[PDB]
Design a protein around this nucleic acid. Structure first.
Ligand SMILES: [Zn+2]
Lengths: 86, 71, 52, 100, 119, 50
RNA sequence: UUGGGCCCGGCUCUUGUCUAUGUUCCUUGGAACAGGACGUCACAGAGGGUGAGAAUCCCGUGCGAUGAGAUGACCCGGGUCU
RNA sequence: GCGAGAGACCGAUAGCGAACAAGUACAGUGAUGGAAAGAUGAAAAGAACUUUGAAAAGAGAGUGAAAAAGUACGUGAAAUUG
RNA sequence: UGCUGUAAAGCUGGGUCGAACGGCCUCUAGUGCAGAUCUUGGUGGUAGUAGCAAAUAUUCAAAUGAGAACUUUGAAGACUGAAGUGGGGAAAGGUUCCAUGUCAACAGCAGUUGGACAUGGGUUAGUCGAUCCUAAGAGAUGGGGAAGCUCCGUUUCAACGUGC
RNA sequence: AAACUUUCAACAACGGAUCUCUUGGUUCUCGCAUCGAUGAAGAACGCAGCGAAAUGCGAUACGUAAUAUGAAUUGCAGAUAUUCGUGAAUCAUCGAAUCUUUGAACGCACAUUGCGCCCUCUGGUAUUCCGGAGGGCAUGCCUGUUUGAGCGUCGUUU
């Protein structure tokens, strides 16, 4: 009875949604995320999992602030406003 | 919702998800200058908030809804 | 070619006894790639013989 | 493993050597960039020469006694004999070696 | 194209909020009409006008704060430079140009000479 | 279940809104490649995994 | 043997703008950007687009010219005040 | 990472897993695993209208250089089939 | 359609097709498939075959509809027989709820029907729950280990009130 | 003799090979040095006149300001929008801003949109209660300020 009969008794989620990554990998009893390591300060990431780094890294999101760093550096981090040409 | 303005003297509004009944009761006082007997709130399955505002007997809900302009 | 081309898989051979060739196969399930061969120069999506 | 009248070889390729293969594709690019750097450095300080004056010294070993090459800097005694202080010498294009 | 920004910048604190309230009730009235039209492109125009007035109010307000804090040693961090975290930790021009008095005496005594050869 | 948290209900709201057919006027745009909504989901076939 | 602060350039970087010559004739073709004839420009016969293999239709290319903005105690070339 | 220029490189079962709403759909409790999928035509000009049919569709007609290009779209091989 | 060559193959006639391609002298290689229980994709025979047989059981008429064994209504005949095939909930699911329209695919026959498809609508709390308490336990702080990720400890060798 | 089986050819199927393409990949070279408590990378949820995704953005939400340029956008619709002009569209440029809930994430806590405390203003006849708006309240460490503790200790007076 370890196959179909035992598979009918699955109604207690071991994992719930994580807050840092929202992946449903938050182990409820351990109070830890199996994906990002929450609530550890550092992100869970390993060099034996290179495909895992591809899935969650810089460039996989919005980069809402890192988009414009190259643009601001190219102008030398200007301060002030643009001058209208007469 | 248009049945409640006539039967129950109740106005139906879409309301911000972050608000509470205290803020909703005040808001209808600046916007329409009407007094709410109570505010009943509801979060819809699509993710928005719906408020059932029953006005005191001093105001007629149908009259106010004509002033707003949706009946 | 890229050094990891054709080798971005975790494929393991099913061994013998399953009536299939002993080429390494993609594990898991739910995708049509599951159960398909990998890592071979004869395989679709594997790495070429003697990569340049 | 060993089958012929052939020399016995020492090919040190039992480590992960393919991860440390440095092919100098940029030899011509490095040559061009080196020339451009040299040109810019020369133009920055014209007409002052780019190279400081170097002494001449004997190459140390029994094998290279005969040869004589360029040293690193003139000794303090040598500059003393020509009336140039080392601190002033370093500012007029002469290299100084306090060790020799 | 809605309200003109250069006209807003000539309006006071009192007038900008009076205009802001009206634009909000303009949007409130239109959202009632959207239930019946149902297509109403005027929605987009009023929203940008609300954004423009909110922008002019904030920019005019931040300029008073900048003038108040002109020349003070400590000013609000949002009014400070936002170059990068690393560039803010860098030594300033005055700090990096500091020299020990021994170092200055030797640099003055032995400057880099200018000379030529073959003469 | 009927008793649910706010985050649970908040995710279900987004799942319903993403499960609509493709609007018709989209296919009329120039150089349009989308012919249908390819991320449809049925409640009985594929589970949300929340 | 000799100090410092600015003002204008140069050098370094980014960026704006500006420029030669066929769409002439005939055939095929839905379309000429094809074939033939006659040419033109070329410091430009790289590349791309345009209803088929387009230097010459268009953008560019080549040649440079001329603005704006930065940046450099730790570059110099002039000034100017100490 | 950012910005460029190239090649006796591959040419959609190849080349990065990904030329496409690709780390997407999907699977797994989870760590993780992970695809398939480019091409009408110069231009939709994407078949008005009549007729049969419950309709889908068919037959005429029409557009187009071509419908031996009808979106189940360039060519259309073989297995297999009428 | 044929021709040439011992052959690997080359050239050609007819049809289809619409945009690039070939000979010769050299260079170069990810360069020749019938097999690898080869890989991926596609298609057969088997074969209109096996089979679609647990849960007692359906029938008549009318209506709708192009079309009714299967939809609706009525008339019967039945069954579950209160430890139910009834009425609610916890876990889990997530719009499956309701109305309107609709039948390309799905409901291993059918379909006018549907938990399908499409468009909308729908969940109202001072008193019901959560929220609060503590249980087994988990786990910060002060500290003490550990190269370190972190481990121990839960008032602990602490000057511990964000007191009233 | 049909039927049937097999083979072939034409046509029609099935299927997507071949051919030719290519805003992709791969490799090599050249140049540059720029994330974050002034809140990053990432996540969630939202935002369009009619949008599901992708792209963009954050309740100022397929975006605001500014500089440049100079007549569009486009599937449809539409100005209380524009044309010898402070003027259409523009991630063209970009120096000002906005930047939800989070996240190193910082009042405590978080399988909860839970529970506080402080300051200013305001509503309810209110220093105490309740409601609202705004601004705050993490840890280690450094310099300083203030308030302290210790017969640790110095001078004095019983
Ligand atoms: Zn996580």
């Amino acid at each position: 009875g370890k196959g179909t009969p035992s598979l009918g008794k699955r109604h207690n989620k071991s994992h719930t949604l994580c807050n840092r990554c929202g992946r449903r990998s938050f182990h409820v009893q351990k109070k830890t995320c199996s994906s990002c390591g929450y609530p550890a300060a550092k992100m869970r990431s390993h060099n034996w999992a290179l495909k895992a780094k591809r899935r969650r890294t810089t460039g996989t999101g919005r980069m809402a602030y890192l988009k414009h760093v190259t643009r601001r550096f190219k102008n030398g981090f200007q301060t002030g406003v643009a001058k209208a040409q007469t | 919702a248009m049945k409640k303005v006539e039967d129950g003297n109740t106005l139906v509004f879409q309301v911000d998800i972050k608000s509470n009944k205290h803020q909703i009761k005040s808001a209808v006082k600046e916007l329409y200058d009407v007094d709410a007997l109570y505010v009943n709130t509801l979060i819809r399955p699509n993710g928005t908030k719906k408020a059932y505002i029953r006005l005191t007997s001093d105001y007629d809900a149908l009259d106010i809804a004509n002033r707003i302009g949706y009946i | 070619v890229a050094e990891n081309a054709g080798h971005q898989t975790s494929a393991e051979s099913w061994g013998t006894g399953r009536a299939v060739a002993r080429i390494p196969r993609v594990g898991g399930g739910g995708t049509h790639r599951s159960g398909q061969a990998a890592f071979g120069n004869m395989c679709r999506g594997g790495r070429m013989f003697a990569p340049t | 493993a060993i089958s012929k009248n052939l020399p016995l070889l020492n090919n040190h390729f039992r480590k992960h050597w393919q991860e440390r293969v440095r092919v100098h594709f940029d030899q011509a690019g490095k040559k061009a960039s080196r020339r451009q750097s040299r040109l810019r450095k020369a133009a920055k300080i014209a007409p002052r020469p780019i190279d400081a004056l170097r002494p001449v010294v004997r190459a140390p070993t029994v094998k290279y006694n005969r040869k004589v090459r360029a040293g690193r800097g003139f000794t303090l005694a040598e500059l003393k004999a020509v009336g140039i202080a080392p601190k002033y010498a370093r500012t007029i294009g002469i290299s100084v070696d306090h060790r020799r | 194209a809605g309200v003109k920004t250069f006209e807003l910048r000539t309006k006071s604190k009192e007038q900008l909020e009076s205009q802001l309230v009206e634009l909000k009730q303009e949007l409130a009235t239109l959202k009632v009409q959207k239930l019946q039209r149902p297509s109403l492109p005027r929605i987009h125009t009023v929203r940008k006008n609300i954004a423009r007035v909110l922008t002019v109010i904030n920019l005019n307000q931040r300029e008073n704060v900048r003038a108040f804090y002109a020349g003070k040693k400590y000013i609000p961090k949002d009014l400070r430079a936002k170059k990068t975290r690393a560039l803010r930790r860098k030594l300033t021009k005055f700090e990096a140009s500091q020299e020990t008095e021994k170092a200055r005496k030797q640099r003055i005594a032995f400057p880099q000479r200018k000379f030529a050869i073959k003469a | 279940p009927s008793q649910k948290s706010f985050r649970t209900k908040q995710k279900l709201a987004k799942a319903q809104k993403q499960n609509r057919p493709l609007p018709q006027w989209i296919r009329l745009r120039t150089d349009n490649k989308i012919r249908y909504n390819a991320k449809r989901r049925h409640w009985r076939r594929t589970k949300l995994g929340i």
